[PDB]
C-alpha cells in the first residue's frame, strides 16, 4: 500500500502574554505518533503510538532538540513577518509549517512536501521538483531570495528523498501490526420518521481505519448524490473514524434504496438496506 509521513508545526503569538505557543505533531498516514507543546512543564517530544516507544533515549533527545530549535526559529520568524507585512506588535499571528513525504507500495519516494503559511494563507512552498519555490506574495519573495541564496531546496531534497523515506519505512515495519492493517467499517442502516409520509434512512460506517472511505446511497441502482446528506469524516478517539450518509425516502419505498460502502479493509464493497 502507499503511505505518508508528515510533521505539522504551529506557533501563535500572544503579545503581552509571554512568548508564542508552539505545538508540533507527527503523523504516519492517519496515525498520530509524536507531539511537543512548548507550554508543557519541561517540554520533551513524547510518543503517542506504541511502535515509536522503542526508540532509545538518543532518538528522543535529538527530536527534543529539534522541537525546541523550531520553537525558537518560529519566534524569530513571527518577528520577521511583522516587518514584512508592516504590522504592529499588538496582534496575535499564526505561523504554520508542514513537511514530509509520500511513498509507494515498494517504498520509493512518490512526492515530498515542505510548505509555510502565515495567518492561514499560503506563504512559500517547495515545488514538487524539490528544487524551486512558489512564493505567494512579495514578502515571501524576500524569503525565497534568502532560501535560494542558501540553497535550502537542496537541503530539503536530500532530507525528503533520504531520511524522510528511510525513517517512514522503519516506522511502517515497527508499526506493522497497526499501520499496515486497514480496519473495515462496521455498518448499519437506521430509520428516522419525519412524518407519516417520509423518513430519513441513515447509513453508518463506524470503526474504520484509515479515514479514506466512500459512502453513497442509490435508488433503484441510480446514484442519489444531490439528495444525500453526507457528514464529514470524524475521529472516534480510538484511532478509528466514523461517517454517515442519509437520504429522505417516502414511506414504504425503503427497499428501493441501497447504501454502498467502499473501504480498503472490506473483503468486498458492501451493499446494505434498511432491515425492519
Amino acid at each position: 500500500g502507499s503511505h505518508s509521513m508528515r510533521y505539522f508545526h504551529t506557533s501563535v503569538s500572544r503579545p503581552g502574554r509571554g512568548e508564542p505557543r508552539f505545538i508540533t505533531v507527527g503523523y504516519v498516514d492517519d496515525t498520530l505518533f509524536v507531539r511537543f507543546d512548548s507550554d508543557a512543564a519541561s517540554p520533551r517530544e513524547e510518543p503517542r503510538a506504541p511502535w515509536i516507544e522503542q526508540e532509545g533515549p538518543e532518538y528522543w533527545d535529538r527530536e527534543t532538540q529539534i522541537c525546541k530549535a523550531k520553537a525558537q526559529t518560529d519566534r524569530e520568524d513571527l518577528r520577521t513577518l511583522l516587518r514584512y507585512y508592516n504590522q504592529s506588535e499588538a496582534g496575535s499571528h499564526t505561523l504554520q509549517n508542514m513537511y514530509g513525504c509520500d511513498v509507494g507500495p515498494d517504498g520509493r519516494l512518490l512526492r515530498g512536501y515542505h510548505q509555510h503559511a502565515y495567518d492561514g494563507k499560503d506563504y512559500i512552498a517547495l515545488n514538487e521538483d524539490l528544487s524551486s519555490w512558489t512564493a505567494a506574495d512579495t514578502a515571501a519573495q524576500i524569503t525565497q531570495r534568502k532560501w535560494e541564496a542558501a540553497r535550502v531546496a537542496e537541503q530539503l531534497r536530500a532530507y525528503l528523498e533520504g531520511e524522510c523515506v528511510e525513517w517512514l519505512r522503519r516506522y511502517l515495519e515497527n508499526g506493522k501490526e497497526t499501520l499496515q492493517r486497514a480496519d473495515p467499517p462496521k455498518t448499519h442502516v437506521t430509520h428516522h420518521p419525519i412524518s407519516d409520509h417520509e423518513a430519513t434512512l441513515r447509513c453508518w460506517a463506524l470503526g474504520f481505519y484509515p479515514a479514506e472511505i466512500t459512502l453513497t446511497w442509490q435508488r433503484d441502482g441510480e446514484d442519489q448524490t444531490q439528495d444525500t446528506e453526507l457528514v464529514e469524516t470524524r475521529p472516534a478517539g480510538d484511532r478509528t473514524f466514523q461517517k454517515w450518509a442519509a437520504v429522505v425516502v417516502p414511506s414504504g419505498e425503503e427497499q428501493r434504496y441501497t447504501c454502498h460502502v467502499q473501504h480498503e479493509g472490506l473483503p468486498k464493497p458492501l451493499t446494505l438496506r434498511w432491515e425492519p
Binding site: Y7, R62, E63, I66, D77, T80, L81, I124, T143
Partner: peptide, 9 residues
C-alpha cells in the same frame, strides 16, 4: 524522524 537543520524566513 525530523530534519535537523534550522530554517528562518
Amino acid at each position: 524522524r525530523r530534519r535537523w537543520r534550522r530554517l528562518t524566513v
